[model samples]
Target: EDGDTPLHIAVVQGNLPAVHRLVNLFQQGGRELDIYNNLRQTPLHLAVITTLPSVVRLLVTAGASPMALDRHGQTAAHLACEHRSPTCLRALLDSAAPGTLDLEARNYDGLTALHVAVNTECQETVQLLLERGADIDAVDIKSGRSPLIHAVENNSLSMVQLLLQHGANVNAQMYSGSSALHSASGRGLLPLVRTLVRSGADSSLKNCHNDTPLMVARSRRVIDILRG
Candidate 1:
């Protein structure tokens, strides 16, 4: 931001020594720790974009608000998942004041921290968010697709399995009324379709196009499984 504050540069450059000094300087002057740049991202947000959670740990401990949102309306934890930095996310969760981070905080596109985690397919990050009790069935406002639906769409059998085991509604539907089964079948992911069916996904469910999971399936093997 010409607007890039010196503290923001310190965090972005991975200069922990200088960042520590800046954080200390803020404490001495009674200054604001969560100042904004051109993008409205605070040092806390920039800290998480780096792989080192120590920077975020010190930043948050120095009173950086992890709950502060960027221009995209994403919190540090939300940005953590987007960047596949579970360590940074864990640091944000633990290093901040207890309960300071809102896992449900939505981005500009209405994506939750969990939604971004699942989209990344970084199971460790997804598991980290889930372990912290992020909503498993939370749907995106864009398409109303839940994490389980996103898992199937990505053909991630293990991710779908993980979400289902965590009690994600197997038959959770999208804005179009399509469930995980519809995405799995349409994408020709046999194991995904099988796993979803065994998890109790309703193959007979219809979407906005009046198509069931079976109707959308093109592969013979997948069609046979859906037909059953």
Candidate 2:
């Protein structure tokens, strides 16, 4: 199946007027708004990844499901956040049911929209997702790494602070039993380790291999920080 409809092509071309006209034509016919293409992505999903806010709004108004998942189980919001399109992200959120968009859906990798935003280093998008009620401690299905752990792993000091301010668990361990401190210290991120410590991360906590944050410290500065 080529998997595309008239609406899908219109959106792919970023043809705003054509998108509007097709949406209206389909609306009158009472057609489904959630049609999938070859990739199993809806028109809304395409509009989002392309960062077309106007097309996104039209699709949503025409009754597209904000929570619709693609072949990888990713939603339009997931794509929006991953692409760091604030306008498209906002449109998706506004189109969702209240509290329904709060990080409940995951892609094939168990990554929520919050995880995608953090992984992309989209600070504003991350903040917006959090403000929209993304679960800060929500674990990824693949690695069990939470948003805080990811921020630490990415060496995002500001993201670390933003997550901490919003109540992320500093000592939350992954499926491998590695905590944020374990990752930060191992990465030789002095400032991130310091921030985690200030936020009350336990240095003495051990991973599955019995390695403490100090044991995994990659730098003398990190060791000193852990020791102190």
Candidate 3:
């Protein structure tokens, strides 16, 4: 079997009435709720990718498990973050058993939902994940870079401010020992560098090359900002 159930088709088509009827029938017939497709994605996963909150709600109400992993070891929550669907993300969060959604659940690359939200520039989703308790200092498995570092690397001044306000570690280091300040300084992001310094980022922190934020500063303004 390719694992494509009638419910899967209903969800893919975004047929709310059909989904409602099918869910009811599944309930009556005692069918499995977490059936996976060829990609290992469940009906809930498909519904989230489709960005259909109502369908997600219907599936959750029908006892669909939000914890089901697709081939990527990603849950509906992860998909919601990747797709930047806050409504679907909330539905998945509320539908899961308390603490079962595992906000820290990583994909094969060890990127959490917040990581996806941050990298995608999904501001609302990022705020929601943070408010709901995503780890602000969580590092990516590959780069060992935290969300703040990612924002700095992307020169996202607002994101850096938001993350700092929410308590992201200013000095959180990557595998190379590069901090958010280091990233910002190297990229000549004066605003981000200033924010990180004001937020108490250590100017003396060195990376693998033993270079401080000041050492990495390419712009005169950034160098002055770090020196101060």
Candidate 4:
């Protein structure tokens, strides 16, 4: 808006009411209801990336499309999952009609919402996405790493648990033959290492470097978890 629409000002100041007013105005104007800002972002994306989950719900209920992708091909759900905003994630999911979870959406990186969710510690969002039938094993087209690989690299035990509970393949390897166990041991993630062990992950799994999990652990001086 040349003079600033209510949504624009609301996002800058985190003002929910202003956003609501503007969204209502746009709806009444017979606009597409899913119009983007100058940056090509939907109002929901602005709300979510700004950490304003409350405003997000307001817009979402007012006909904002949570699944609408911006120029970057990012949906509001993707932003919420990436930022670890469980509130926003839940609100978006609940607002969606059933049978929309597998909408085959992808972010700019070609990573699905599931891949983005794992980067955050939002276990609830991660679980919900997986439970709703989001692909837990979707590989990032750019990196060839899946959600499991990302969780392991981050040393996130709770996230790893969530992924495993959703039937994520523990043995799925990245492009270079890097398994979750390889990442955990290399990163010295003791809890993650233990979790993998309990899940029957191969401690001897190696990467393209021929470096086994124990070898990686040894190189990282994490003998305790490796031995345990």
Candidate 5:
């Protein structure tokens, strides 16, 4: 039936005493803490993503695989960011001693946690990841889009500034060779184009189409901005 367990409920409720006894009972009976229930979720994975890091810290300290993959290939590290649980993410990160967790672990979508963090306007989560040394410009496998480039596609100006403030390459391009400026210009995002240029985007840069951002420019305003 792929049902649930007291072990699972104890984790969800952060009942450390209950969680401790259940996990111990299971392990003593030759069951693993990481054994999937609900088509795939370990107590550790569930604990890491649900609420505060306190519960997750308890789980990992009890010997859960800090980096176990779900059915989606998402480690607890990726899920924490995906769920916007930065504190919990950090808890698992620090609790795991930074060794078992792979912040760059690719998920089912071929994106790392940082990429997921950037794809939304979640600045606090993104900063936690960056401070923890997640690659600010880590590229996705599908399109070679850097986190900065991905931020632009999501149309998040705050995220763009955040990544830029964190030293994301302003001139970084997609696999197609279209730079951030190139996309911003085509989208007629005047402010982002301005932001990109102010941060040192090269208008003269060409894409696979051999066209500069100005050539892709949609509005006269962007054209003048790029023409300069």
Candidate 6:
């Protein structure tokens, strides 16, 4: 418990050389490579959050467990995405536990990293999560809104198209029997409405009050598209 372990200072300053020295010293001392700070973050978590790719590599090579959950159930993968560091994200994924699933795992918002990526309008991050196996259909527990639902709700047509291409169920009911098309129609998202209809979304599906997607669209002044 040296107050000035090379690991702590390396992470603080984003210094790769200090990380290497720490790794060498720890190896000789047989010290556990992945020591958590007061915040429950391992050295790699700090490195990744700081966008220190080299220090991250040192920790990973030293067998740090990137999959270990902090107090928030967040692995290093979560921190990497939270920090918007795609390089660190990739590094975390590469060193994850053997059976580690990708970004489909739920975070604090009941949202996958893809959902957070969607909310943040991080298209490249969304694509990266998809490539790494994020489940496009994963839904929120409270609102019952999936990533595809959010895409249509937020009028993100490109994300909607990407989700469809990746097999998001266009007809799947979310909150109280509402489908993605319901969200699009309610928001008067015309392009999304057209895309959903063309892609086989069922406008007839009803919601908690038994209002159909078309019915909601009509009340919301989306009648122009509802007529078809």
Which candidate tops lDDT?
A: 1
Model 2 over residues 183-204: C-alpha lDDT tens digits?
Answer: 9999899999899998899988
Tell me the TM-score of model 4.
0.78
Score candidate 6 by lDDT: 0.76
Distance from true location, Cα of 138 in model 1, Å: 0.4
Candidate 6 residues lying further than 4 Å off, grouped into runs, are 2-6, 218-221
Question: Candidate 2 regions off by >4 Å?
Answer: 1-4, 99-102
lDDT per residue as tens, model 6, 36-74: 777776787788778987677678768887766666767
lDDT of each: 0.88, 0.86, 0.86, 0.77, 0.84, 0.76
TM-score of 5: 0.93
Error of 1 at 137 (Å): 0.4
CA lDDT of 97 in candidate 3?
71
lDDT of 5 by residue, 1-228 (tens): 258677877887878888878877987888777878875888888887667588788778777886788988888878887888878887887888547777888888799989887875688789998998898878878879998888888888999899999999898888779999999999998889988998889999999999999999999899988767
Query: Model 5 off-target regions past 4 Å?
Result: 1-4, 27-30
TM of each candidate vs. truth: 0.92, 0.92, 0.94, 0.78, 0.93, 0.86
- Candidate 1: worst-modelled 10 consecutive residues by lDDT: 96-105
Pairs of residues clashing in candidate 5: none
Runs in model 4 with CA error above 4 Å?
1-3, 10-21, 50-54, 98-104, 203-211, 214-228
Model 1 alpha-carbon drift over 4 Å, by segment: 1-4
Query: Model 2 — TM-score against the truth?
Result: 0.92
Worst 10-residue stretch by lDDT in candidate 3?
Answer: 92-101
RMSD of each: 1.9, 1.9, 1.6, 3.3, 1.8, 2.5
